[PDB]
Amino acid sequence: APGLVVGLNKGKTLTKRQLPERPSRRKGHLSKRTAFVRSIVREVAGFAPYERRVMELIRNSQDKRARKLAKKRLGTLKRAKGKIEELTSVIQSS
Amino acid sequence: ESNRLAAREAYKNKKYIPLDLRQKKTRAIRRALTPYEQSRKTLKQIKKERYFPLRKYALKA
Amino acid sequence: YVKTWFNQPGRKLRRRQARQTKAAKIAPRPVEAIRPAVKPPTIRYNMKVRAGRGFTLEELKAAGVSRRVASTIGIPVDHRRRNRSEESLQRNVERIKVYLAHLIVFPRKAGQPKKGDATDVSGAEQTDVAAVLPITQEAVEEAKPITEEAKNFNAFSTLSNERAYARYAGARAAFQKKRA
Amino acid sequence: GAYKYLEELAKKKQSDVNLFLSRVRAWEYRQMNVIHRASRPSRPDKARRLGYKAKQGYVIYRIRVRRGRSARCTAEERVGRYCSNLRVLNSYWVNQDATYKFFEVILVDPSHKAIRRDPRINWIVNPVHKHRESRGLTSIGKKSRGIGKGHRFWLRHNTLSLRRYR
Amino acid sequence: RKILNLRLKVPPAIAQFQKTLDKNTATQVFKLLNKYRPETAAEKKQRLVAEAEAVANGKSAQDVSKKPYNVKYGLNHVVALIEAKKAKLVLIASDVDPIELVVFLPALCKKMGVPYAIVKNKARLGTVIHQKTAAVLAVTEVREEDKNELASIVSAVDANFSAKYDES
RNA sequence: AAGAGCAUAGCUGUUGGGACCCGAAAGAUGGUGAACCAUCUAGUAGCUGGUUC
RNA sequence: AUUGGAUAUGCCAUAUAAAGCGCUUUCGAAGAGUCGAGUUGUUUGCAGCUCUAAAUGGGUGGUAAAUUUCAUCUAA
RNA sequence: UUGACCUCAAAUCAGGUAGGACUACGCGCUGAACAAUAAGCGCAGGAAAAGAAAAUAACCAUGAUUCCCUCAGUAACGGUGAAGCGGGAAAAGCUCAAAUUUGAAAUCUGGCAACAUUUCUUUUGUUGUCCGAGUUGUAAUUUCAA
C-alpha cells in the first residue's frame, strides 16, 4: 500500500493486524486416528480393479498409459496424479 | 346429566376414560403437542438459560 | 398480476403499532439493539461508514465481555465478520465501551448487586441507541499546511507508469525468470 | 467408536467385500416385498448420522425402485403413502442390481410418547412437517427443486406494481 | 445363495467368520466369563443403597468395594479399548447380520497383536452380559488367581484358533 | 468556449396491453354420453356492419 | 369471570453442585453411488444412463497463466 | 429333554394414527394449444416456503433468510432479462453424526398403586413399583464461531 490506487502493492496504507486462524480452515488436516483407520480399511478392503490394472503398468514401467487411463477413470488431472503417486508409494512399500 | 356425571366421578383419577367423556375441542388441538412437551428441552439448553438468560438493562440518556 | 398499493397507509400504521407494542412489551430495555461501525465493501462506497450486523469475536475479547454475556445484555455478535485493520478493532471497541458505560443492568433475584451489574434501578429509561450511540461518518481533515514535497510529486510519475508497471509486471516477471 | 471404520468401508463401493455383500443382499431384497419393515438398518452409521437413534418411535423401511424424477424421491413418497401415519425423517441408499435401486428410509412416529418428549425431534410432531416429500422438503427433495444458498441457484416479474403516487 | 456364494468365492475377509472356535475352548472361555458377569440391575440397586450410606459417611472406601472386575462389551466401547490396547481377550459374534460391523475387527486386532477369537452365536454372548444381544465381548483385566487360566486359554486360543487361522 | 435541466398537471400523436364496439372455421386441457359440456378465449378479424350534441 | 407476566410476600428446594472466562505442554474426529466427469432429455438447475473421487482435501471466484497464485466458504 | 436368540405369522388383545372437505394465499409433479401459464395429480399453515454461507466480492472489505426502493430495462442471451453493491422493513439464534462413563445405561415407552394439577371431574403431569425397549448404543460433554 503506497497510499495509492494502482500497482501490485495497491491499497490504502495501514497497519494490518495478524488475524488468527479459524477452525473452518482446519479441514483437510490429517488425524493420526483417521490416518490409522484409512490404513486399516486400505489393508482389509483391497483395491478396485482400475487401480489394480494401472499398478503393474507402473511395475512394467508403463507410466504414460497408466496416467492416461487413470485420467479417463476419474476425470481430472489432479485426481489422476494424486492417485498414481499414492499407488507408487504402495508399490515401493510392498 | 345424571348418568354422565355418575360416569365422571366413576372414572375420575382413572387414566383412560370413554371417548364420549374425553375433551372435544377440535381434531388439530387434540393432536397438537401438549405444553409440557412444548416446554421440554435438553439440559444443554437448561444450562444456557440458567447461566446466561436474557437480562433487564437500559441506557442513560 | 397487478400489485396495487392501496394498503400503504395501512401497512405503515401496522408497523407503528408493531413498534409501540414491541417497545411497551420490553419497555425497560432499548427498542433497537446496537450495531458496529462498518465500511461498505466496494470502491464506490468504501469511504462511507454504515452499521453492520454484529461485533466480531476479536472486539468482544478486547472489550472484556464474553460472547455469552454480550448476547444476554443486547450486544449482537457476528461470527462471519473478521476485522483486520486495527482501527476497525478500535472504532468498534470504545463503541462497546461507551455502550457498557451508559448501560445499567438490573440485578437478578430481588435486586442484590451481583458482580458489577448495577445498584440503582429507578433509572429505568428506554432511550434511542442512535442518540447516545450515533454512527459518525469518516473524520475528514481541514486546514493542513505545507506538503510542498508533494508539490514536486507530479502525480502521473506514480499513476501513469506504476499503472503501466502493474500492467506489465506479469510480462516483466516472466522475462526475469526466463533469462535466469 | 466403531463408526469411523464403517463409512470408510462404505466409501469403497467397488471393493470385493462390498461387491459380494451387495449382490447377496440384493438377491434377498428382490424376494421380499417391494417395501418391507427392517428390524435394524443395514448401515447403522449412515442412518445414525442422518438422524436415526435406536429408540422407540424411529423405524426403518427398505424399498426398491425400478431404474430407467429421482429414484431417491420416489422412494420416500411411496413409503409415506404406505406408512401413512408416520413422518418420514430421511432416506439413504443401500444396493443396486441391473434393474433396481434399493433404499432404506427412516420414519419417525409423530404421536408416540417417546418422540414427543425428546426435544431433538419434537419439531417433526408439529403439523407443518406432515408429508414433506409430497411437498418436496426432504434432503433429496430440497436439492431436487434447486434450493440452496448461492448464485448457482417467477411471480416477482409477471406482476405489475402500481404505487399510489406514480 | 449357494450358486451366488460359490460363483464368486467368499472373500477371506468374510470367509474368516464361517470358521470359528471349537466347542471345548468355547465352554472354558464361557466358564471364565461367568466369573466376571456384569452386575445385575437388582444388584445395582442394592449397591446404590450401599453407596447411599457410604456417601453419608464420607463415601467410605472406593464407593464400598474394590474395582468392579467384569467383562467389557459394546462395539464402540471395545473398539476404543482395543485401540488403547487395554484389552487382553476379544470375542466376536460369528453371525452378526450386517457383517460390516465386525468385518474389520479381526484385521484391526491382528495389527494390535491381541489374542482374539470368534465365539458361536450372539445370544450366548448377550446371555453373558444379561442382554438379548452382544455383538462383541472384551476382557481387559482380571484377578490374580484368574490370571493363570486366562493365560492358559489365551495360549490355547493361540494354539487352536488365532495361530492356526492367522491370515490363511 | 462562461452550463439548463429536474419534477408535476393538461392537450395532442404514437407503441403495447381485450384496446372503439360487433361478428369466421377452428385448436388445446379436463370432463359427460354412446357427439356433447366447461374452461383456456374478451383468439387469430390483413375484413363486414355500426360508432351518440 | 378468568387470565399477561412482572412486584412484594410466604413455603419448599437441595446446592457434597455445574457452568462462563486467564492459560494451554495437543488433540482436534467434521456427513460417498456423494462430489465430479462424459452422455441423453427438459426448464446454469434438475433428471435417466456408464464410470466414480479425494484430505490442506473439496466448492467457488479475482488473478495469473491455461496453469497459477490469491481470496473466500466447508456441501452431500 | 428343556431354555434362549433370531425370522415370520395370528388376535373381535391394549393404546394410538391415516383417509375426506376447503384450497384466495404455500410447496411440489405434470403441462398444453402464449408459458417454467390455464387444466390435471399430490400435500400444508395461519401464514407457507426460505434461512444461520461449500454466500459475496477484489474493497479501508461485506456477513442467515424474507420483503420494498435502487441497481436496471443494465449485464447477459437472442424479444427475453437478472444479480453484487447502497438505502429501508425485521432482526435470533442454533441442534445432531463423527471420540467412552467403562468405577457402574447414568436413558427411555408401557402395566399397576398413590400424590397432585386443570380453560377442563373432559386436561396435564409427578412419585413409587413392575415390565419391556436399548450395548448393531439410550444419556452427559462437543459441532469448526469451535
Swiss-Prot record, chain A:
Keywords: Cytoplasm, Ribonucleoprotein, Ribosomal protein
InterPro entries per UniProt: Ribosomal_eL36, Ribosomal_eL36_sf
A GO biological-process term: cytoplasmic translation
Gene3D superfamilies the record matches: 60S ribosomal protein L36
Superkingdom to which the source organism belongs: Eukaryota
Cell location: Cytoplasm
Region (Disordered): 1-31
Major localization listed first in the record, in broad terms: cytoplasm
Coiled coil: none
GO CC annotations, alphabetized: cytosol; cytosolic large ribosomal subunit; preribosome
Gene Ontology terms, MF aspect: structural constituent of ribosome
Other notes: There are 2 genes for eL36 in S.pombe.
Subunit-structure text: Component of the large ribosomal subunit (LSU). Mature yeast ribosomes consist of a small (40S) and a large (60S) subunit. The 40S small subunit contains 1 molecule of ribosomal RNA (18S rRNA) and at least 33 different proteins. The large 60S subunit contains 3 rRNA molecules (25S, 5.8S and 5S rRNA) and at least 46 different proteins.
UniProt similarity note: Belongs to the eukaryotic ribosomal protein eL36 family.
Role of this protein: Component of the ribosome, a large ribonucleoprotein complex responsible for the synthesis of proteins in the cell. The small ribosomal subunit (SSU) binds messenger RNAs (mRNAs) and translates the encoded message by selecting cognate aminoacyl-transfer RNA (tRNA) molecules. The large subunit (LSU) contains the ribosomal catalytic site termed the peptidyl transferase center (PTC), which catalyzes the formation of peptide bonds, thereby polymerizing the amino acids delivered by tRNAs into a polypeptide chain.
Protein name per Swiss-Prot or TrEMBL: Large ribosomal subunit protein eL36B
Gene responsible for this protein: rpl3602
UniProtKB/Swiss-Prot annotation, chain B:
Major location (coarse): cytoplasm
GO terms for biological process, alphabetical: cytoplasmic translation; maturation of LSU-rRNA from tricistronic rRNA transcript (SSU-rRNA, 5.8S rRNA, LSU-rRNA)
One cellular-component annotation, GO: nucleolus
Coiled coil: none
Subcellular location: Cytoplasm; Nucleus, Nucleolus
GO MF annotations, alphabetized: mRNA binding; structural constituent of ribosome
Keywords: Cytoplasm, Nucleus, Phosphoprotein, Ribonucleoprotein, Ribosomal protein
Keyword Phosphoprotein carried by entry: yes
Superkingdom to which the source organism belongs: Eukaryota
Function comment: Component of the ribosome, a large ribonucleoprotein complex responsible for the synthesis of proteins in the cell. The small ribosomal subunit (SSU) binds messenger RNAs (mRNAs) and translates the encoded message by selecting cognate aminoacyl-transfer RNA (tRNA) molecules. The large subunit (LSU) contains the ribosomal catalytic site termed the peptidyl transferase center (PTC), which catalyzes the formation of peptide bonds, thereby polymerizing the amino acids delivered by tRNAs into a polypeptide chain.
Summary of subunit composition and partner proteins: Component of the large ribosomal subunit (LSU). Mature yeast ribosomes consist of a small (40S) and a large (60S) subunit. The 40S small subunit contains 1 molecule of ribosomal RNA (18S rRNA) and at least 33 different proteins. The large 60S subunit contains 3 rRNA molecules (25S, 5.8S and 5S rRNA) and at least 46 different proteins. uL29 is associated with the polypeptide exit tunnel.
Protein name: Large ribosomal subunit protein uL29
Gene name of the record: rpl35
Swiss-Prot record, chain C:
The family this protein is said to belong to: Belongs to the eukaryotic ribosomal protein eL13 family.
UniProt cross-references to PANTHER family, sorted A to Z: 60S RIBOSOMAL PROTEIN L13, LARGE RIBOSOMAL SUBUNIT PROTEIN EL13
InterPro entries membership: Ribosomal_eL13, Ribosomal_eL13_CS
GO cellular component: cytosol; cytosolic large ribosomal subunit; preribosome
The protein's assembly and partners: Component of the large ribosomal subunit (LSU). Mature yeast ribosomes consist of a small (40S) and a large (60S) subunit. The 40S small subunit contains 1 molecule of ribosomal RNA (18S rRNA) and at least 33 different proteins. The large 60S subunit contains 3 rRNA molecules (25S, 5.8S and 5S rRNA) and at least 46 different proteins.
Protein name: Large ribosomal subunit protein eL13
Gene3D superfamilies linked: 1.20.5.110
Originating species: Schizosaccharomyces pombe (strain 972 / ATCC 24843) (Fission yeast)
Pfam families: Ribosomal_L13e
One function term, GO molecular function aspect: structural constituent of ribosome
UniProtKB/Swiss-Prot annotation, chain E:
Entry keywords, A to Z: Cytoplasm, Phosphoprotein, Ribonucleoprotein, Ribosomal protein
Main location (coarse class): cytoplasm
GO biological process: cytoplasmic translation; maturation of LSU-rRNA
Localization: Cytoplasm
Domain of life: Eukaryota
Family: Belongs to the eukaryotic ribosomal protein eL8 family.
Subunit structure: Component of the large ribosomal subunit (LSU). Mature yeast ribosomes consist of a small (40S) and a large (60S) subunit. The 40S small subunit contains 1 molecule of ribosomal RNA (18S rRNA) and at least 33 different proteins. The large 60S subunit contains 3 rRNA molecules (25S, 5.8S and 5S rRNA) and at least 46 different proteins.
The protein's name: Large ribosomal subunit protein eL8
